[PDB]
Amino acid sequence: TVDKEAPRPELYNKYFSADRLHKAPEILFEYNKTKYDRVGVRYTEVTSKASERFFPKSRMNRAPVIEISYREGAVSTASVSLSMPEISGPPALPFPVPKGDVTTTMVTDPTTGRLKLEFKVDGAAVSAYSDPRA
Amino acid sequence: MLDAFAKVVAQADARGEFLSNTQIDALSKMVKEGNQRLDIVNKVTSNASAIVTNSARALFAEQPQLIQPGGNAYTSRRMAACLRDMEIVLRYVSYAMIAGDSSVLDDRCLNGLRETYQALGTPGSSVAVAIQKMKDASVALANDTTGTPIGDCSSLVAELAGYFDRAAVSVV
Amino acid sequence: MLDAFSRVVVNSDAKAAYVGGSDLQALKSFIADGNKRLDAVNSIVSNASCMVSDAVSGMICENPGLISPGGNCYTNRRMAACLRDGEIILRYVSYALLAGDASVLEDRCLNGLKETYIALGVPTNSSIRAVSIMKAQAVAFITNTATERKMSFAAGDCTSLASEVASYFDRVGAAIS
Amino acid sequence: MLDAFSRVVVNSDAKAAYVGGSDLQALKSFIADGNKRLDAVNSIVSNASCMVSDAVSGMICENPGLISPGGNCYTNRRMAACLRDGEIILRYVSYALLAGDASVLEDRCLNGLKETYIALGVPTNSSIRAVSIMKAQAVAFITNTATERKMSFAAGDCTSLASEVASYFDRVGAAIS
Amino acid sequence: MLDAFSRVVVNSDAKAAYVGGSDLQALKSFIADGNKRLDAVNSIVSNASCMVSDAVSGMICENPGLISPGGNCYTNRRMAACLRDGEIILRYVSYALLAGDASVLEDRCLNGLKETYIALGVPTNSSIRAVSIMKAQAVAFITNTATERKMSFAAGDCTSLASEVASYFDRVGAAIS
Amino acid sequence: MKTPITEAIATADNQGRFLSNTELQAVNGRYQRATASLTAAKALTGSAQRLITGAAQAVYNKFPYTTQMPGPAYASSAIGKAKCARDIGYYLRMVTYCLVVGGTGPMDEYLVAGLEEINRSFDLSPSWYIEALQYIKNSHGLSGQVANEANAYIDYAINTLS
Amino acid sequence: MKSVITTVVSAADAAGRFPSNSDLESIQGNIQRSAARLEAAEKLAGNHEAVVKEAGDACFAKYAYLKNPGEAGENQEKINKCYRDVDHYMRLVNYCLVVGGTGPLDEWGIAGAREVYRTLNLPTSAYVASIAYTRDRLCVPRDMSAQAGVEFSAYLDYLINALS
Amino acid sequence: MKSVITTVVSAADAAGRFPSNSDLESIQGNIQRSAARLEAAEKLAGNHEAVVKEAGDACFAKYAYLKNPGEAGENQEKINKCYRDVDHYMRLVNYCLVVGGTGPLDEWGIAGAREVYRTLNLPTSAYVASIAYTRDRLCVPRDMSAQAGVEFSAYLDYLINALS
Ligand SMILES: C=CC1=C(C)[C@@H](Cc2[nH]c(/C=C3N=C(/C=C4\NC(=O)[C@H](C)[C@H]4CC)C(C)=C\3CCC(=O)O)c(CCC(=O)O)c2C)NC1=O
Ligand SMILES: C=CC1=C(C)[C@@H](Cc2[nH]c(/C=C3N=C(/C=C4\NC(=O)[C@H](C)[C@H]4CC)C(C)=C\3CCC(=O)O)c(CCC(=O)O)c2C)NC1=O
Ligand SMILES: C=CC1=C(C)[C@@H](Cc2[nH]c(/C=C3N=C(/C=C4\NC(=O)[C@H](C)[C@H]4CC)C(C)=C\3CCC(=O)O)c(CCC(=O)O)c2C)NC1=O
Ligand SMILES: C=CC1=C(C)[C@@H](Cc2[nH]c(/C=C3N=C(/C=C4\NC(=O)[C@H](C)[C@H]4CC)C(C)=C\3CCC(=O)O)c(CCC(=O)O)c2C)NC1=O
Ligand SMILES: C=CC1=C(C)[C@@H](Cc2[nH]c(/C=C3N=C(/C=C4\NC(=O)[C@H](C)[C@H]4CC)C(C)=C\3CCC(=O)O)c(CCC(=O)O)c2C)NC1=O
Ligand SMILES: C=CC1=C(C)[C@@H](Cc2[nH]c(/C=C3N=C(/C=C4\NC(=O)[C@H](C)[C@H]4CC)C(C)=C\3CCC(=O)O)c(CCC(=O)O)c2C)NC1=O
Ligand SMILES: C=CC1=C(C)[C@@H](Cc2[nH]c(/C=C3N=C(/C=C4\NC(=O)[C@H](C)[C@H]4CC)C(C)=C\3CCC(=O)O)c(CCC(=O)O)c2C)NC1=O
Ligand SMILES: C=CC1=C(C)[C@@H](Cc2[nH]c(/C=C3N=C(/C=C4\NC(=O)[C@H](C)[C@H]4CC)C(C)=C\3CCC(=O)O)c(CCC(=O)O)c2C)NC1=O
Ligand SMILES: C=CC1=C(C)[C@@H](Cc2[nH]c(/C=C3N=C(/C=C4\NC(=O)[C@H](C)[C@H]4CC)C(C)=C\3CCC(=O)O)c(CCC(=O)O)c2C)NC1=O
Ligand SMILES: C=CC1=C(C)[C@@H](Cc2[nH]c(/C=C3N=C(/C=C4\NC(=O)[C@H](C)[C@H]4CC)C(C)=C\3CCC(=O)O)c(CCC(=O)O)c2C)NC1=O
Ligand SMILES: C=CC1=C(C)[C@@H](Cc2[nH]c(/C=C3N=C(/C=C4\NC(=O)[C@H](C)[C@H]4CC)C(C)=C\3CCC(=O)O)c(CCC(=O)O)c2C)NC1=O
Ligand SMILES: C=CC1=C(C)[C@@H](Cc2[nH]c(/C=C3N=C(/C=C4\NC(=O)[C@H](C)[C@H]4CC)C(C)=C\3CCC(=O)O)c(CCC(=O)O)c2C)NC1=O
Ligand SMILES: C=CC1=C(C)[C@@H](Cc2[nH]c(/C=C3N=C(/C=C4\NC(=O)[C@H](C)[C@H]4CC)C(C)=C\3CCC(=O)O)c(CCC(=O)O)c2C)NC1=O
Ligand SMILES: CCC1=C(C)/C(=C/C2=NC(=C\c3[nH]c(/C=C4\NC(=O)[C@H](C)[C@H]4CC)c(C)c3CCC(=O)O)/C(CCC(=O)O)=C2C)NC1=O
């Protein structure tokens, strides 16, 4: 976290100070046609990344998702919806993993679940070592 | 006790899975309103003896049969125990204001409160009409624009009503 | 009412919208084979999460150098950023399936992505291998010829829409070549 | 509170401050056509991310030697600095639209801007080309005449505030002329 | 049994007043929102066979120790009773919302089912996992965001009403608790 | 389960008190470590799949006998490894649960309460278990104060077994 | 208490059934009734301090023998019981106009009524001599609305059939 | 049977009560619906040749196992007599749509059906899809109107939720 790479020779200091550097007033708007509609300004540091020639910060990772409710022959209650949120991907890829090592996972809507995999077979606490000594 | 963050822990511990990403942006909406929660509990407990004695006074005005001799709240032992329970609901409602759910109000104070009152014989319809004075003396207290800057806190005053009507239907 | 759909995709923010029963009849009448097409987008997005989890791990299964130290699937934020780049193109190709064109695909998703990937150090031929699995995975879900899953459908063919996504997935691979 | 708008800026310090509903109409009575003017800023800052990206890429795709090795829009730290540089001149012209004068834009942004660019080797003929795309966007957004995104507004004319921002962009171009 | 219309009468009885205009203002707005509540409970009772399907076949996959020989839902009378014990408790809250008052739920069933259940031997934590599986099953239906069946309502926002059937079912679970 | 909100309430109740300005400040600091702890347990689920068995191989390459020993209490055969995608996932689950509430709530009653009875009578010695999450504390991919708040409840779970 | 809601669910509890489509057009029967119902209720509260006097003196403008010695209205602390007991009858009328049934009448004012009027030597028809003066005093567009007067007078028909 | 008009006078007969105001209120809400409710049954009758020509064989179009040797829908004395029994169910809702109640279903068809069809070698699942295709075929403005279709749906699902 210290990418001193602006070569940056000190010849910009007589025209732009160090504290007043890349700082601009950002204007905020709570405009919702309501009684509590506020306008506000704040003055923060401005950062950017190199990707934003074609994918700017409003359009960053916003892809149109589709949700379809359709029962069989139920077009009077069937519906389509459309939104583009800030879409995150699925949960991360695991370890390389050797002769199995109980491959992990996760699924379902309410909660993340997550089980345990022995490469296809999903053991997950059945206690196969069941040997009393009578 | 449980607050709102302790809800979805135990609402996913029996479910088993981790915290999903579609829930927590509603919970990071709640910390935007975290500063409009703590003024509002400070509005109630600064006036915590002027909502009690101004509403017990307006209770015995309309119902003179409680302070008449042979009434329920007649003696000085049972007057002090009427002002005690009128302040007890004012604590456990404001405990539920700061937390985000009802589940300390109706687990430590409302779980058998009307069946406490049926055994003692107090009029359980009449404690609800003292609480609804304290509802109107506190919702109209928490809409002042002095001490705070202005802005729409209309979402957070319905939660303060919604536990005052939860004690209004607990005691009957 | 595709103007109501296009105003959702042009506002560049998070906004939910949905269709009632009257405007869905305007959707089914304006777009040809709408009984076929709305099935074909539903067969993908019901199993879109397994499609992005299989294909980039199949990219690991053929190119194991990405999870090397120094590879591009190391440092698990960057591994999730490859998963985040997995999921945007599936939502964008499904709307390209739904609108019947690639004109929303080119400007919002495919413009300058080759210049983005060669500036970020992204191995673009590895993503060609990852998106070629997606061309096979979308065809087996549109034709319902998946080996492990079979969803119920109405009878008939979908080979126009099965060939239309191969036109759409080749536009992604031509954009990043 | 227009001075307390300025007191966000002039104490050089990062805060947040707002204006409430009863405090709005004191500013709205003072500033003429404040219902137009608060719409004029909100047409810009709702698309402030998209305004810098069409401005910088039109500078790139007309002047293709800038992204050369040796050009000034190579070496992605230097690309991200140029995208940061278009943002600060967008927020300062947006605050000049709110305050009604360019006198906070002249000293904070444009003062010393000329020879600090030949201090680093910025091609200023490309920079005047870069800000002129933002001059074409802001007259499209305020007049609601953008070719792809229309927005909902109260019906009327906004041709004075279209010319005022186009006056205020010309002070940026004359500062680096 | 209490009604919400009856609730203001005993409010006005120990107070010994008449009915004024003050507490009347709650109930006249309750009239015009009566059809919206009347558009709610008809879909609660008409998808009730699905709600008692997923009451008991859903709780048994997350503790299958009751279908084990020796469990508390093993025999086909206790299999029959658990299908029957859940279809009365949602019949009672369909009565309770039209009055608006929870006391009709209290005096009929919620006064004393807990004292029977430890002499009937059934566990209460299994019950509240089967109570709460009807809780989110209910609140999908009032809002029309259910997946496999979508029904006919009007357009609005009954989230004040959708909290109320969630305000019942926790006290259903807290009664067994 | 002891949330930092809920002991402002429970240490206003045993004295029988309204919520004064003392306990109003302790819930403000819970609202100040809110955002810097909520990026932790969100994105730890986003990289959770590598962290389960990438930490398990950081135990068997520390301890070769755990795959080689004849016993039920190890990951030697294929049935012990299926418990080892479960019994150290519980350690990865409750460190996410502590960053929701901003305190050491859920692992204080679910995990650590009555643990030596489980350890000595299964011979599941925590010399594997400390190194099971010692791979997690340095290979999570997190920087800044999001790193130090995610590492705050990991080494509380270290010191309870050590 | 007998209301318009208590008939619906106590039958459906005796039926062992859900609230069907049949059970809810008493509730559409409620809200078409309850618009012009409650205009009668608040209008009574703007007059009733005179109305229990102006119908209350009419039974003393009918039966002057109550003021004799040995009788019920013999002195002033017994005559203010007679205005206590007639205001509590007309306090149950506006309760009966809110709930839309007859339950507050038939538990607090009618149930057990005529067994105590005999034993305390009070006339059972001097009460209905009083609220008969409440019944003819209506001119229907002025005091009430044009439909709300009949739905207020229908509860005056109930209580004079309860004492007679 | 139970309609709205008999369910107030049955609980008035079990206590011997007079017709009260709440009994007078419960009839009024039928008039707000039966302008639109009694015109749904006449569309149900003139189309009755073609709905069971569409949906009565749709549960044979999902199920070719109903025509096996030793079944219910196998031959012309039992294929055409399937259309005997299924057009009674169109006729039964035509008797429910005109009364405003759930009366003629469990007067005639719903009453004890689980000890009828557990004998006749009949699944209940064949009875499901004949009306399950009939109900989801409702688009709003053609067979119905807006406020007419809010309760014809409620008679489509009332037989669904009863026998299942
Ligand atoms: C207070 C107001 C304020 C500004 C207006 C900007 C002005 C500004 N820009 C840059 C710095 C820069 N500005 C640009 C921008 C461009 N070069 C081009 O070729 C394009 C024409 C254009 C973008 C569209 C680039 C590329 C650099 C970095 C140069 C380098 O690091 O080599 C610097 C760096 C020197 C220093 O930090 O002292 C400053 C002060 N920053 C501010 O703080
Ligand atoms: C609207 C347009 C839009 C997109 C098309 C996506 C594409 C996209 N991905 C990344 C960013 C990234 N994308 C990848 C993805 C990959 N690298 C690989 O080795 C694999 C081949 C592939 C995954 C399968 C990675 C690893 C990063 C991380 C680089 C970083 O975070 O700096 C960035 C940020 C780059 C920047 O800041 O300039 C963007 C814009 N997101 C968007 O907003
Ligand atoms: C220890 C005790 C303690 C508190 C009680 C709060 C008090 C508090 N509130 C606000 C600030 C504010 N507070 C309100 C609140 C209200 N305005 C209304 O009309 C309602 C009556 C009321 C809600 C109950 C509003 C509208 C703002 C400004 C908007 C904002 O917070 O950004 C601020 C300034 C910082 C900020 O803006 O967040 C502070 C310190 N904070 C604390 O540390
Ligand atoms: C509201 C959302 C909505 C949908 C999701 C679709 C769903 C849909 N498609 C068809 C009807 C059909 N659906 C398909 C589609 C397919 N058949 C296959 O074997 C392929 C696997 C699949 C293509 C991907 C075909 C081929 C028909 C028949 C021809 C047609 O109507 O287009 C039908 C009528 C079925 C019938 O006649 O009984 C419905 C409801 N339509 C909608 O209105
Ligand atoms: C370790 C190395 C490794 C790989 C090389 C790949 C293996 C793999 N699977 C598929 C192919 C596929 N993968 C899926 C995806 C799924 N199927 C389902 O039923 C689920 C819903 C979903 C996640 C499992 C589908 C639908 C196909 C096409 C049909 C098929 O071949 O199974 C393909 C593309 C077809 C091909 O060109 O061969 C490949 C390369 N996966 C790996 O793990
Ligand atoms: C490859 C070469 C290349 C270019 C030549 C430019 C293309 C370009 N676009 C605009 C022009 C514009 N650009 C925008 C910006 C937007 N429009 C929207 O709907 C979004 C919200 C937002 C981000 C896309 C607007 C609003 C206009 C003015 C409307 C118009 O004339 O197009 C202009 C200025 C007008 C002119 O032509 O003189 C140019 C030069 N960009 C490039 O990359
Ligand atoms: C809290 C934040 C806040 C805002 C964002 C503005 C928003 C705003 N502008 C106008 C009202 C208006 N707004 C515009 C502006 C425009 N009309 C056009 O055709 C152009 C596209 C655009 C120029 C930029 C005009 C011309 C009027 C009517 C004249 C006026 O009231 O100024 C109105 C009143 C609308 C009405 O009630 O009829 C409001 C609320 N005001 C605020 O208080
Ligand atoms: C354990 C084994 C197992 C099952 C038996 C099914 C049952 C099932 N269904 C739902 C979840 C649900 N179940 C229904 C019910 C229905 N949907 C309709 O539209 C029909 C009319 C109705 C009868 C089927 C609804 C509405 C939801 C909520 C999801 C949704 O549709 O939005 C849930 C999640 C509820 C919870 O646990 O919190 C479960 C477990 N799924 C399983 O995993
Ligand atoms: C107000 C509604 C209402 C009820 C619930 C029942 C209450 C009730 N439930 C059961 C009886 C029962 N109830 C259940 C149901 C369950 N037990 C479980 O383990 C699960 C948690 C749950 C299913 C969801 C079972 C399994 C029996 C046992 C039947 C038996 O013991 O023979 C019995 C005994 C019946 C008898 O002895 O004849 C009674 C009175 N009656 C009512 O009027
Ligand atoms: C014969 C049987 C019978 C019924 C079924 C109801 C039918 C019904 N529903 C509504 C009307 C309505 N119902 C809803 C309710 C909802 N809309 C939503 O978006 C949610 C999904 C859902 C519950 C929150 C809303 C928002 C209205 C419109 C507001 C209103 O006028 O009531 C209305 C009033 C307007 C109209 O005439 O259409 C009526 C009569 N009443 C009856 O007598
Ligand atoms: C809950 C509702 C409610 C009621 C309906 C009344 C009914 C009522 N009235 C009286 C009691 C009485 N009521 C009258 C009234 C009358 N005698 C006359 O000469 C006239 C006919 C008539 C007034 C116009 C008198 C005179 C007594 C006193 C009895 C006595 O002197 O012994 C009593 C006995 C207790 C007492 O003395 O106050 C009661 C219960 N009170 C209630 O609390
Ligand atoms: C809440 C219900 C309610 C009522 C029933 C009346 C009852 C009533 N009437 C009058 C007073 C009056 N009331 C009437 C009305 C009538 N005289 C007749 O002969 C006709 C039967 C009838 C309609 C023409 C008239 C004409 C007077 C003036 C004096 C009198 O004759 O009583 C007064 C005195 C104060 C006033 O004028 O308002 C009262 C309380 N007022 C009410 O507020
Ligand atoms: C008594 C009630 C009753 C109904 C519900 C309909 C049901 C129905 N629809 C159609 C026939 C039709 N029905 C529709 C309309 C629709 N078809 C659908 O699947 C949509 C859900 C719905 C509204 C869009 C259309 C467009 C046709 C002609 C094409 C076809 O056969 O489906 C037919 C064939 C004969 C005819 O044209 O009427 C029948 C019986 N008819 C009735 O008599
Ligand atoms: C932990 C929180 C807590 C609750 C919830 C609580 C309820 C409670 N209220 C009580 C009594 C009482 N409560 C009241 C109060 C009233 N009766 C009326 O008629 C009025 C309507 C109302 C006062 C406004 C009265 C008069 C008593 C009887 C006191 C006695 O008999 O000594 C008692 C018997 C012990 C006593 O206080 O004397 C309990 C346990 N006590 C608690 O400590």
In the reported structure, the alpha carbon of residue C73 is separated from the centroid of ligand 2 by a whole-number distance in angstroms of 12
Chain B neighbours among D 124-163 (CB < 8 Å)? none
Question: What's the CA gap between D118 and D177, in Å, rounded?
Answer: 12
Query: Is B35 annotated in some ligand binding site?
Result: yes
Ligand 13, residues at Cβ distance < 6 Å: A 75-76; H 43-44, 47, 50-51, 54, 137-139, 142-143
Q: What is the sign, positive or negative, of the torsion defined by CA atoms of E9, E14, E18, E21?
A: negative
Do residues A31 and D16 lie in contact, with contact meaning Cβ atoms separated by under 8 Å?
no
Structure tokens at E93: 């809250």
Nearest CA in chain A to C88: A63
Ligand 3 atom closest to Cα of residue B38: 5
Q: What is the DSSP letter of B71?
A: S
- CA angle (D49 as vertex; D46, D54 as ends), nearest 5: 120
Which residues, in sequence order, are CB contacts of H158 under 8 Å at separation 6+? E46, G20, G21, H96, H102, H105
3-state secondary structure of A130: coil
Question: What's the CA gap between B167 and H59, in Å, rounded?
Answer: 54
Provide the total of helices (H) and of strands (E) in chain E, helices listed first: 11, 0
Q: Is D156 left (phi over 0), alpha (psi -120 to 50) or beta?
A: left
Residue carrying structure tokens 């090397």 = C68
Which residues, in sequence order, are CB contacts of F5 under 8 Å at separation 6+? B3, B5, B98, B99, F27, F30, F101
Which residues, in sequence order, are CB contacts of C177 under 8 Å at separation 6+? C114, C124, C128
- Check CB contact under 8 Å for A90 and C21: no
Q: How many Cβ atoms sit within 10 Å of the Cβ of residue G137? A: 12
Please list the alpha-helical segments (H only) found in D31-158. Answer: 34-45, 48-62, 77-99, 103-105, 124-142
- Does residue A21 belong to the interface with chain D, where contact is any CB pair within 8 Å? no
Question: What's the CA gap between F53 and A94, in Å, rounded?
Answer: 7
3-state secondary structure of A86: strand
Mutate to test the interface with E, among H144, H156, H161 (most CBs of E within 10 A): H161
Atom 18 of ligand 2, residue of closest alpha carbon = C122
Question: What's the CA gap between B29 and F27, in Å, rounded?
Answer: 16
Give the CATH number for residue H8: 1.10.490.20
Instruction: Specify burial of residue H30 (Cβ count, 10 A radius: 0-12, 13-18, 19+).
Output: buried
3-state secondary structure H46-99: HCHHHHCCCCCCHHHHCCCHHHCCCCCCCCHHHHCCHHHHHHHHHHHHHHHCCC
Which residues, in sequence order, are CB contacts of F75 under 8 Å at separation 6+? F56, F60, F66, F67, F81, F83, F84
Ligand 1 atom closest to Cα of residue D127: 21
Ligand 6 atom closest to Cα of residue D145: 29
DSSP string, E84-135: HHSTTHHHHHHHHHHH--THHHIIIIITTHHHHHTTTT--HHHHHHHHTTTH
Chain D partners within 8 Å of B149 (Cβ): 18, 20
Which residues, in sequence order, are CB contacts of B138 under 8 Å at separation 6+? B43, B44, B47, B51, B160, B164
Q: What separation in angstroms does the CA of D56 have from each of A25, A58, C115, D62?
A: 21, 16, 14, 10
Return the bridge partners of E53, or none.
none
Edge to edge, what strands does the sheet with A39-45 contain? A23-29, A39-45, D17-19
In the reported structure, the alpha carbon of residue E109 is separated from the centroid of ligand 2 by a whole-number distance in angstroms of 58
Q: How many Cβ atoms sit within 10 Å of the Cβ of residue D58? A: 17
Total of domains in chain G:
1
Q: Which of E56, E59, E85, E126 to mutate to test the pocket of ligand 9 (most atoms within 8 A of CB)?
A: E85
Residue D20's domain comprises 1-177
Chain C partners within 8 Å of D47 (Cβ): 12
Nearest to A27 among D98, D111, D120 (CB): D98
- Reported structure resolution in angstroms: 3.3
Atom 12 of ligand 2, residue of closest alpha carbon = C81
Q: What is the DSSP letter of D110?
A: I
Indicate the pairing of strand A79-83 with strand C16-18: antiparallel
- Does residue B25 belong to the interface with chain F, where contact is any CB pair within 8 Å? no
DSSP string, F36-91: HHHHHHHHHHHTHHHHHHHHHHHHHTT-THHHHS-STTSSSSTTHHHHTTTTTHHH
Atom 26 of ligand 9, residue of closest alpha carbon = E78
Question: What's the CA gap between A24 and D92, in Å, rounded?
Answer: 6
Question: What's the CA gap between F132 and F91, in Å, rounded?
Answer: 9
Ligand 13 atom closest to Cα of residue H134: 5
Chain D partners within 8 Å of B151 (Cβ): 18, 20-21
Total of domains in chain D:
1
Chain-centroid distance of CA A94 in Å reads 18
Chain B neighbours among E 13-42 (CB < 8 Å)? 13-17
Return the bridge partners of A86, or none.
A62
- Does residue G109 belong to the interface with chain E, where contact is any CB pair within 8 Å? no
Question: What's the CA gap between H77 and H29, in Å, rounded?
Answer: 46
Point out residues after which chain B has a gap (C–N over 2.5 Å).
Answer: none
Q: Is H75 left (phi over 0), alpha (psi -120 to 50) or beta?
A: beta
In the reported structure, the alpha carbon of residue E146 is separated from the centroid of ligand 8 by a whole-number distance in angstroms of 9
Chain A partners within 8 Å of E151 (Cβ): 77
Mutate to test the interface with A, among D116, D148, D149, D176 (most CBs of A within 10 A): D116
Backbone φ and ψ for A67, nearest 5 degrees, come out as: -120, 130
Question: What's the CA gap between C46 and C36, in Å, rounded?
Answer: 16
